[PDB]
Design a protein around this ligand. Sequence first.
Ligand code: SF4
Ligand code: MN
Length: 187
Amino acid sequence: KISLDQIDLLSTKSFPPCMRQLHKALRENHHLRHGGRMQYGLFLKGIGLTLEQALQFWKQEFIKGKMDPDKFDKGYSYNIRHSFGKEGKRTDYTPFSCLKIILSNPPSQGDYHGCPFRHSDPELLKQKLQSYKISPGGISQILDLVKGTHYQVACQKYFEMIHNVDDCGFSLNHPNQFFCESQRILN
RNA sequence: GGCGGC
DNA sequence: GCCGCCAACATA
Ligand code: SF4
Ligand SMILES: [Mn+2]
């Protein structure tokens, strides 16, 4: 039911901070390192994109990197298809859970995947928070949670704020969960 | 990105 | 240099 020229907006309204970052990085750089391609792609699949859309969404954005639209089908295409289970063993991979994102494959320079509340240093996170126009009160309330390593909670806090609600009404532990709950209130 | 093949 | 095959796991 979801369309491609709608994502940019969705990223702002329903994507959790992690997917939002990964999306912006993809539009700015017209590319993403493996770690981000994994987390983001499975997420996009989890929200609704079909294999036809996925291949289009990614090819389109990668041509702007000015690389061979052929050098794309060479490497990147096969892997996208294997994500939707259309290659090899044929496994329709479930998107990443928060705990996984938070405790594994920590990000390094050049990477944008991972969990902002966990992998972005307090000072950079603050700037992002502000960039999303989050009230300095909640920003402060988030940083606290972050300091107590309650990353997922801090993200729930972010939910409640960007949706103007008192209680998100669920415990967060999967990015696409954040998405759906958002879609519930907006759509 | 890793592993694997030439 | 060409290429194949993987990983995940919430979820009402
Ligand atoms: S809480 Fe889970 S989803 Fe919300 S940002 Fe941290 S990782 Fe991505
Ligand atoms: Mn590569």
